[PDB]
């Protein structure tokens, strides 16, 4: 859904997103978008923001992730919409 060139572009998270990434072991100030998604995925799995019965929805209410994305839940199927929510959180 997302072109490879766009996934491989270097970006600079704002500090709140950076906090999130660091919490699951990220160590740098800049990442490709593909790396940002890897660490966000790790964060969702670590904090169990998944739902066993309807796995395609992430539940992020009362979590830093929901404050950054501006939503209490989102569909994992919507890659462009997820990219947009992440771009809001970059310098
Ligand atoms: C039918 O149910 C599905 C279908 C697809 C996905 C999914 N899809 C993957 C994905 C989704 C969006 C993008 Cl832009 C890239 C990769 C990845 C993922 C990565 C980052 C985020 Cl923010 C959310 C999910 N993701 C996953 O499958 N993940 C999350 C990361 N680590 C995992 O072990 C599994 C899914 O994830 C939930 C279990 C959270 C459930």
Curated annotation (Swiss-Prot):
Family: Belongs to the MDM2/MDM4 family.
Region (Sufficient to promote the mitochondrial pathway of apoptosis): 1-84
Record's disease association: Seems to be amplified in certain tumors (including soft tissue sarcomas, osteosarcomas and gliomas). A higher frequency of splice variants lacking p53 binding domain sequences was found in late-stage and high-grade ovarian and bladder carcinomas. Four of the splice variants show loss of p53 binding. Lessel-Kubisch syndrome: An autosomal recessive progeroid syndrome characterized by short stature, pinched facial features, prematurely gray hair, scleroderma-like skin changes, small kidneys and consecutive kidney failure, followed by severe arterial hypertension.
Any further remark recorded for this protein: MDM2 RING finger mutations that failed to ubiquitinate p53 in vitro did not target p53 for degradation when expressed in cells.
Upregulating conditions: By DNA damage.
Protein name, per record: E3 ubiquitin-protein ligase Mdm2
Stretch of the intact protein here: 18 to 108 of 491
Function, in words: E3 ubiquitin-protein ligase that mediates ubiquitination of p53/TP53, leading to its degradation by the proteasome. Inhibits p53/TP53- and p73/TP73-mediated cell cycle arrest and apoptosis by binding its transcriptional activation domain. Also acts as a ubiquitin ligase E3 toward itself and ARRB1. Permits the nuclear export of p53/TP53. Promotes proteasome-dependent ubiquitin-independent degradation of retinoblastoma RB1 protein. Inhibits DAXX-mediated apoptosis by inducing its ubiquitination and degradation. Component of the TRIM28/KAP1-MDM2-p53/TP53 complex involved in stabilizing p53/TP53.
Expressing tissues: Ubiquitous. Isoform Mdm2-A, isoform Mdm2-B, isoform Mdm2-C, isoform Mdm2-D, isoform Mdm2-E, isoform Mdm2-F and isoform Mdm2-G are observed in a range of cancers but absent in normal tissues.
Organism of origin: Homo sapiens
The record's note on its domains: Region I is sufficient for binding p53 and inhibiting its G1 arrest and apoptosis functions. It also binds p73 and E2F1. Region II contains most of a central acidic region required for interaction with ribosomal protein L5 and a putative C4-type zinc finger. The RING finger domain which coordinates two molecules of zinc interacts specifically with RNA whether or not zinc is present and mediates the heterooligomerization with MDM4. It is also essential for its ubiquitin ligase E3 activity toward p53 and itself.
Lineage summary: Eukaryota, Metazoa, Chordata, Craniata, Vertebrata
């Amino acid at each position: 859904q997302i072109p490879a060139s766009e996934q491989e572009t270097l970006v600079r998270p704002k500090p709140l997103l950076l906090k999130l990434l660091k919490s699951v072991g990220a160590q740098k100030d800049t990442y490709t978008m593909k790396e940002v998604l890897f660490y966000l995925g790790q964060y969702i799995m670590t904090k169990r923001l998944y739902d066993a019965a309807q796995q395609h929805i992430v539940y992020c209410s009362n979590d830093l992730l929901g404050d950054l994305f501006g939503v209490p839940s989102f569909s994992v199927k919507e890659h462009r919409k997820i990219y947009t929510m992440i771009y809001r959180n970059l310098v």
